[PDB]
Structure formats: structure tokens, C-alpha cells
Design an enzyme around this catalytic site. Structure first.
Site, PDB file in Angstrom:
ATOM      1  N   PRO C   1       0.845  -1.193   0.000  1.00 31.55           N
ATOM      2  CA  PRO C   1       0.000   0.000   0.000  1.00 31.55           C
ATOM      3  C   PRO C   1       0.873   1.232   0.000  1.00 31.55           C
ATOM      4  O   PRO C   1       2.019   1.180   0.452  1.00 31.55           O
ATOM      5  CB  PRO C   1      -0.815  -0.125   1.302  1.00 31.55           C
ATOM      6  CG  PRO C   1      -0.943  -1.578   1.543  1.00 31.55           C
ATOM      7  CD  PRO C   1       0.289  -2.198   0.970  1.00 31.55           C
ATOM      8  N   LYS C  32      -1.866  -6.221   5.162  1.00 27.42           N
ATOM      9  CA  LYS C  32      -0.738  -6.417   4.228  1.00 27.42           C
ATOM     10  C   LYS C  32       0.497  -6.453   5.074  1.00 27.42           C
ATOM     11  O   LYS C  32       0.579  -5.804   6.084  1.00 27.42           O
ATOM     12  CB  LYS C  32      -0.709  -5.273   3.207  1.00 27.42           C
ATOM     13  CG  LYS C  32      -1.952  -5.127   2.346  1.00 27.42           C
ATOM     14  CD  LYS C  32      -1.912  -5.852   1.052  1.00 27.42           C
ATOM     15  CE  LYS C  32      -3.054  -5.440   0.138  1.00 27.42           C
ATOM     16  NZ  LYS C  32      -2.915  -5.907  -1.256  1.00 27.42           N
ATOM     17  N   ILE C  64      -3.582  -2.274  -4.175  1.00 23.87           N
ATOM     18  CA  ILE C  64      -4.271  -3.356  -4.911  1.00 23.87           C
ATOM     19  C   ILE C  64      -5.260  -4.092  -3.985  1.00 23.87           C
ATOM     20  O   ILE C  64      -4.939  -4.488  -2.894  1.00 23.87           O
ATOM     21  CB  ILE C  64      -3.240  -4.337  -5.506  1.00 23.87           C
ATOM     22  CG1 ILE C  64      -2.289  -3.631  -6.466  1.00 23.87           C
ATOM     23  CG2 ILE C  64      -3.941  -5.472  -6.228  1.00 23.87           C
ATOM     24  CD1 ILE C  64      -1.132  -4.481  -6.906  1.00 23.87           C
TER      25      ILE C  64
END
Lengths: 117, 117, 117
Positions: C1, C32, C64
Site C-alpha cells: 500500500p 498487508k 491493490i
């Protein structure tokens, strides 16, 4: 709306209060209330615009609804160019604008997202 | 094209003239004339990249037409990585690039939008 | 990110190590690993938020997969607001977040693009 302005003018060459006057101008131009307008000015950067390091400015405008067509953006462009050329003492060849539509699911406000408000 | 570079290198560790050399490099890599290339460098920021605050740089590249496929972007990535690693004395693990396609209705130029020019 | 934070707090009013704590917080909130989290903090800017030049912050989050729905973003918003209000001593009316989905063809890493890795 969100307005972000990058410039290679030093901070002490950007007229005092520009962020407030840009906020008021954007409310009128974009047709949104001033209490929904956000401005960020980042001065003193190292920039080239059209291949030249002479004084310049880059403006980005992001909003729901009002920046999504060429016709709308042409109208906004005229007014923002007039404001910035005269406030910053720049020619029209030393400014570019980018326009970015947003949607309500993308905006976090008061701990939630605008789509749920 | 529009190139924006954020780094946690202080301004006096970014080699003099980087913005001009990046402008010339981008014209060659992206296949656009230098008089259509715009560069913004923002040094002295507080950054972490891949979880680490060691020196790093983030590059964003936005353009009409030439940054819209993986194949195009792979080619551009190789050259921009070579340029930035060698100019800034960074390893390849300390740079990331983001690519953003634009359309002509999004670009304000000389008081209008590019779609009408 | 990728997290980008603009603020009108001076650098010496942004608590030391914020970029590292924001990196760790984002890994937990977005799900993440920390070695995939990138943070950029740009302090000392001239800003208005909701028409006011009082202290404020703008956060942009790009990733994503995990920032692409209102439901996901509502959850993330709650945690990021809590973190920033308490770290920066700001009320919830002085922060806005924008969320931007990315795709793998847009990310340049180690001289190629993520779509090919």
C-alpha cells in the site's frame, strides 16, 4: 473538492493568504459550498514545466460530479488560469491543471465513508 | 507527461539539476518532446518504503497514451530505475514507480482543456 | 500500500517516528505485510480543509485489492481516523481520506512491473 498546488516559487514569493483566496474562488467556480473546499499548497519545490525550470505551478482538482466532462472542465480552466496567473504573476504557459473525478465510496470522512452518509 | 518524485533525501543531497536531467531522460524514454515534459521534485520528506526509513524515492508518471499497458510500463520502468538508482545512489529496492494514464479532457492548458485543442 | 499524508503542522509539531508508526498501523489495518507498506509525510504545507486554515491533515491510501469498496473503506477509515486524531491531536473534522485502487500493471518494482512478477 480537493485542490493541490505545487510550485517552484519559494514560500515567501507566494502571496500571503493564497490558500484562503483559492478556497473562496474554487467554491464559486465549482459551485460547491466553501465548507466543502480543501486546498493544499506545496511551495519551494524543484520543477520543470514544458521543459523549463522558470517559475511555474501545477494544480490538481478532484471532486464528485463537477470535473467529469470536457465542457465542465473548459469552463473551470478559464477561471482557475485567470486566478493563478494574476495572483502568482505567471504567464498562462506556466500553469497546467489536471482534473480527477471522485466517487463517494473513495472519501473517508468522520471515521466512515461518504457513500454511507 | 507529468513526473512527480518524492524523496526523504534532503534537498542538499539531491544532485543539482536533477529536475532538468529527469525531464530530458523522460522525453527519450516515453517518446514525447521535452517541451511536453513536466517534473516535480519534493525533497526532505519523512518516508518509509517497504517498511524502512532508509533513503528512498517514489516516482509517479502520468501521461496520455504511453503508460497504459504492462508491456509499455515494463520498458519505461527499466530506464527510470537505472536513471534514479545512479543519480541518487539508491539500490533498486529503494524506488517504486506508479503509472497513471490520463485523457485529454482531464488536462487544463492555456485556459481551456486539451480535448478542445 | 501507499499512504501519503499532507499536513499544515510544522515538521517539529509532527511527533517523531510518525511515519514508522503509521507504517505499522497500516499493515495491521489493511491486512498487508509491513514490508509492502510505503508512507510519505509532507509537513509544513499551507492548507485549508472544509474552508478553514486551522491544523488539518489529508491522507491518501492507494493499494491493490483492499480499498475498492465502500464496506472495506468504511472499516479502514475508522482505524485511520483514530490513529491520526490521537497522534496529531486533531479533531475528526480536520482529517479527510481519499482511497485509490491500483492494479499490478501500474506498479514499477525492481526495474519491471508487478504484472510480470
Amino acid at each position: 473538492p480537493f485542490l493541490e498546488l505545487d510550485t517552484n516559487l519559494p514560500a515567501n514569493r507566494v502571496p500571503a493568504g493564497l490558500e484562503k483566496r483559492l478556497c473562496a474562488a474554487a467554491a464559486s467556480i465549482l459551485g460547491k459550498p466553501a465548507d466543502r473546499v480543501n486546498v493544499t499548497v506545496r511551495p519551494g519545490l524543484a520543477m520543470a514545466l514544458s521543459g523549463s525550470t522558470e517559475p511555474c505551478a501545477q494544480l490538481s482538482i478532484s471532486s464528485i460530479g463537477v470535473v467529469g466532462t470536457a465542457e465542465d472542465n473548459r469552463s473551470h480552466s478559464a477561471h482557475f488560469f485567470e486566478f493563478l496567473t494574476k495572483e502568482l504573476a505567471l504567464g498562462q504557459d506556466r500553469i497546467l491543471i489536471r482534473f480527477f473525478p471522485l466517487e463517494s465510496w473513495q472519501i473517508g470522512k468522520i471515521g466512515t465513508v461518504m457513500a454511507f452518509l
